[PDB]
Design a binder for this molecule. Sequence first.
Ligand SMILES: CCCCCCCCCCCCO[C@@H]1O[C@H](CO)[C@@H](O[C@H]2O[C@H](CO)[C@@H](O)[C@H](O)[C@H]2O)[C@H](O)[C@H]1O
Ligand SMILES: CCCCCCCCCCCCO[C@@H]1O[C@H](CO)[C@@H](O[C@H]2O[C@H](CO)[C@@H](O)[C@H](O)[C@H]2O)[C@H](O)[C@H]1O
Ligand SMILES: CCCCCCCCCC(=O)OC[C@H](CO)OC(=O)CCCCCCCCC
Ligand SMILES: CCCCCCCCCC[N+](C)(C)[O-]
Lengths: 156, 459, 48, 240, 144, 240, 48
Amino acid sequence: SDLGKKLLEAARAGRDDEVRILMANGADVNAADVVGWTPLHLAAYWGHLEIVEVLLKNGADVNAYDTLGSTPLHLAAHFGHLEIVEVLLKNGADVNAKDDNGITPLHLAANRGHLEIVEVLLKYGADVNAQDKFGKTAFDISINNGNEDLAEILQK
Amino acid sequence: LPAGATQERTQKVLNEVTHYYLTKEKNNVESVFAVNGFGFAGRGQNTGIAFVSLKDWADRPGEENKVEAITMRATRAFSQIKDAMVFAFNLPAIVELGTATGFDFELIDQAGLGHEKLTQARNQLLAEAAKHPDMLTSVRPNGLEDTPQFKIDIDQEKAQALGVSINDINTTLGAAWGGSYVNDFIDRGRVKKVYVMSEAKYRMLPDDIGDWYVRAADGQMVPFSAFSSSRWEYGSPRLERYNGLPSMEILGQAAPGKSTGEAMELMEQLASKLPTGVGYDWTGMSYQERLSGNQAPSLYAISLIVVFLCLAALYESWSIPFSVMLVVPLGVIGALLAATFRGLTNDVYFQVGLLTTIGLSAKNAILIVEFAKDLMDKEGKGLIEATLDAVRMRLRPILMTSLAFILGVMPLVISTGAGSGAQNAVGTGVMGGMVTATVLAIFFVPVFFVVVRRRFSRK
Amino acid sequence: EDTPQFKIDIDQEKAQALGVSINDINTTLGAAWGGSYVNDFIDRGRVK
Amino acid sequence: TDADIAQVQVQNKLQLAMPLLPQEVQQQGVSVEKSSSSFLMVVGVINTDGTMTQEDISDYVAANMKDAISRTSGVGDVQLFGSQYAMRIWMNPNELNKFQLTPVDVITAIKAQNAQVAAGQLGGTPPVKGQQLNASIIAQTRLTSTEEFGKILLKVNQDGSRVLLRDVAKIELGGENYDIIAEFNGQPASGLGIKLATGANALDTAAAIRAELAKMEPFFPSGLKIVYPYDTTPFVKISI
Amino acid sequence: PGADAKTVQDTVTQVIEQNMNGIDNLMYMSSNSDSTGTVQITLTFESGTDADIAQVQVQNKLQLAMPLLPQEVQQQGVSVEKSSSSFLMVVGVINTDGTMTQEDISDYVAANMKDAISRTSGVGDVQLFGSQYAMRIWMNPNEL
Amino acid sequence: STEEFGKILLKVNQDGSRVLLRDVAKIELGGENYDIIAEFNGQPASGLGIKLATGANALDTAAAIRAELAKMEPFFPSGLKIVYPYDTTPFVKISIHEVVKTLVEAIILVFLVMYLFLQNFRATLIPTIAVPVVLLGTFAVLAAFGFSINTLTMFGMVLAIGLLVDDAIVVVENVERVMAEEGLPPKEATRKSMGQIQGALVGIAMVLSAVFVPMAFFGGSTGAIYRQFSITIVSAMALS
Amino acid sequence: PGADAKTVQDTVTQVIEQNMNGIDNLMYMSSNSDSTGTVQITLTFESG
Ligand SMILES: CCCCCCCCCCCCO[C@@H]1O[C@H](CO)[C@@H](O[C@H]2O[C@H](CO)[C@@H](O)[C@H](O)[C@H]2O)[C@H](O)[C@H]1O
Ligand SMILES: CCCCCCCCCCCCO[C@@H]1O[C@H](CO)[C@@H](O[C@H]2O[C@H](CO)[C@@H](O)[C@H](O)[C@H]2O)[C@H](O)[C@H]1O
Ligand SMILES: CCCCCCCCCC(=O)OC[C@H](CO)OC(=O)CCCCCCCCC
Ligand SMILES: CCCCCCCCCC[N+](C)(C)[O-]
């Protein structure tokens, strides 16, 4: 698609006004680059709250996965975008979503030490005993990084 | 081509570009040197240049078969190409220098904000620059944008647990996917490099990562999938730095009718409203213009003062020199009329042309005033008598010089061949300037002398 | 002027007998008491 | 004598000796300067809010000021009155012995786990026919914080417990050296001792330094201020 | 070889930039580090500066910074050239019968032409558009 | 050779069989990198980027390069051909020809105009001698100052034609007038004629110096360009 | 060190000589490569 590739650029750039005009013209919201990132992936990555809401209103797949199985919730959680994590979870984002490595939004949130997002994810029913390909939980990450605050939050 | 585009895809576009030039412009184009993988803006598989070589100028009559015409037809024709920004353009007069038209802005990270924050501050400046089309035009980044990159995390615990060293892991990955320069060998009495690397088909996709094995201390072969995890992230394919600090180069030019100086003034004002720790500086052509601009007023002053002092000594008067110096506009008006009419610019050739036009008109005036004054001083003649007797004596040589020189620069004006752009700039400004300088001076010089002499009865 | 300095002799025979590398001794003594510049890192986007 | 040719001739001979020097001396970096023996000026730096220590001020000068002053024409040598920060691994011999580890094991671990790896590209040249994806492969990068150095894995025990670098050492940002400590009227300070390059005009160089310091002041953190406790150039300017 | 923009910057570009001190008549310094594993640091000097004195002063400060660079970069080496110069002409070498690749042509130009053109009267510099042959070992992970 | 690299021993198996480098890799002579694909009308291409040496003649150099490539013609493999996609010397040759044509045509036009007004061949020959002497003198001053024959210096003399032509006409015309008006012999007529203009000509030289000389004192890239025209015009005018 | 005249000529002498192009006032260049692995390249320049 022509407009699909303009929407990917718009969503990434954070050009709220251009995304508005694209949704009206009917730019493909399920458009994906070579790595398989939708506008929602990009919007979630770069932290554009307004565009995430607009794309979800225009039937964007909240549980869309890239070629390595990562979702917008993975990206939003990892890069510490609290507002976007809540919006995604309210629109029915899979909280226990595993990538190809068995990594979850909780794992990524725990690794960068995002306390608010960890509690938001746990509130929406994030499996705290969820293990990756190396058999590591969000708790195993917290004690290894030496995060006492996060270690106290993660008592099942 | 778009971010993450491969070498093969760029070749398809260069083939279309090459095909066009040897089909639609076969009468003009001699050859197309298609360089896939290189760009002046930046390198990569998603960039390329096509150097178009033309036939001899003799075999390309009229503007229809010139670079400017072919460039416009090429640029318009290549507008149809999908998922590629293809356009032609002529080389600058001096390839040693850049385009040397517009400004060269450097956005600097002054407090270790990082790449991501400097990108946001750049996008902010670009957005604010776009809100002033009346002052700023084509305000763009010179460098490249962030692209998807394959981040792989080696689990240190799993590596040590299976008895696999990190050096063996990082060598196996680096050598296979990246390539490794081992040592030198001698091919027909010439020392050349030896490179180890993966055969293409085993280093293409993320699935191929798991096909590579590393031997442990116990001698067991362990695949990369056993002790590695991978995800997608964005990073810079070309990071810039200016004076030791992280930077981003921004190109742009003044809008039609606006000077580059005024365009810089705004770019400075827009830059002062950027986030804390984001500085700026002027480089290249911009750095040159600012220093060159400061000198201009002082050099004019000195030039204009010494001219007056020399004439004052010549004539033995503080007043009479003005009669000569008033001819300057008589030559300049003609050059500007000729330039504006033919559709040329205020370039170096035009500017040096004005000085030689001014110089000869000043010379014509100097001799008329000298003759007129000498008749008044020596032979005791009246102001008007001496002035009329002077212009009479000085009429023939002025007409002879003017007739010869105007005809002499005629071929430069009408020239449409190789290096005609420089000839036109030299010829047009001089011809028009000489026509007015000749016609006006012969009538205006005696007016200047009489008015100045009447005003100042000091000597 | 000359000052008191701590002379230490590494017994080669004893090291060879115990199976202690002389490189490991010199590195251990040098690194601990003198300091060792291992490699570089990035502190707020500057190599240190 | 032309100081430019003198420097080139001296360095030409130094480069014959360089390879024979110990690896530790080469990695510290050998320098060849053409400057006066005496200081041109001392550029003092203090924090009036007192929100930065002598060590914080020294690092900022070294990281954000020194290099640009060192590159300025007329500046032969620049002496930092203080030290730039380094990642300091303060080893504990009791803890190292406890886990049967040595400084050799610590140095090996840092080189292995604080590594910047060149991992190549996906769909790199020469590629196969029909390749649509081209992306840079990113492996290990340099560590950025004391936390990341802290969780460097030295070894794993028989029971499967991890021995991290922070278990055998205290890890902080600290000066390359701790030799030079400066004060300005009894107040914590750093600065730059600037030597005049052989032949260069003292006043022209002083003006060039002030111009460069003026481009840094705007982006200073709160409290940080430039002071001029030693300058020989004002006397020359006023005396004339 | 095989290094990303950040690897090149943080191990090469920053290390060289930090050692570009005590060089006379430097106006400004710019650089870029790309994903093809390349860095170019351009030092621009005042008008009327001896380009030979400028180049050797840059060269000399680089030489002392060479031990601070990675083993793979020291092995490849670091070029210091006067870049402000422009080309007199470009001599193109092609194969019409399609018996030679661009690698084959480049090797011949390097071995049998370049040196002779360099010794030609009035030639100040010669740059090869391509590389001479290299022994390529294309590894197979299944057989390894 | 690739054969020898293929015969490199990697491992000796338990059964006694030998693993060579050709058993686990394809071996061939290739490029150092495969990032750039160069084509010339779709055909595989390389090339050489040649720069002119300091103080060298572009036209002599290009001729010498073509002469050397001609000696290499016989040793080229079958299919290999030399092509010249970029060459500046054909542009430089036309620039010199067109400027020599302009100066020749200018002297011819002065001759015609001199004869139209004065109507005697003896008078028309004085400019024909004077102008070439001044132009030749300009090149001598140009060379002495370390300048070259380039687009800017060549068009510099074209822009100065008017000033050189005028000096010739003014001196001869004024003598022809004095003779026609007072009936003086050529020698006595020249003494008086020069006595009326000698003071002005010296004054004109100083005024034109004041106009052009300061143009050479601009700095940077623009200054260098302006200095080419400035020195050429001031030299040509001074000799005139 | 250890290299024969032929080996050191191919790897050193020829590598340096091919880069000794476009040096101002260069009259002639003489060099020798011997069995001790020693290389000497002498460049003679114009008088003045
Ligand atoms: C024989 C007759 C012919 C003689 C003609 C040639 C005369 C010599 C020309 C000297 C050139 C002077 O060069 C010029 O000097 C002045 C000093 O006043 C400098 O100084 C300039 O700087 C700034 C500009 O805003 C001002 O503060 C100052 O008033 C101004 O003069 C210019 O930056 C420099 O370009
Ligand atoms: C008006 C009186 C004074 C005369 C002023 C003349 C203007 C000054 C220009 C002089 C040019 C000097 O340089 C001169 O140029 C001619 C061409 O024009 C060149 O001649 C060239 O001809 C062809 C070009 O394809 C080559 O085969 C030849 O090898 C080459 O030398 C010479 O390199 C040189 O002899
Ligand atoms: C000694 C005086 C001769 C000066 C020769 C020309 C100087 C170059 C100046 C120049 O062109 O740079 C400015 C800039 C170029 O981009 O724009 C211009 O060209 C503007 C020129 C303004 C001229 C005003 C005339 C003043 C009358 C007293
Ligand atoms: C710098 C002063 C230049 C002015 C030129 C003066 C020349 C006129 C001399 C008059 N004369 C001596 C011939 O009678």
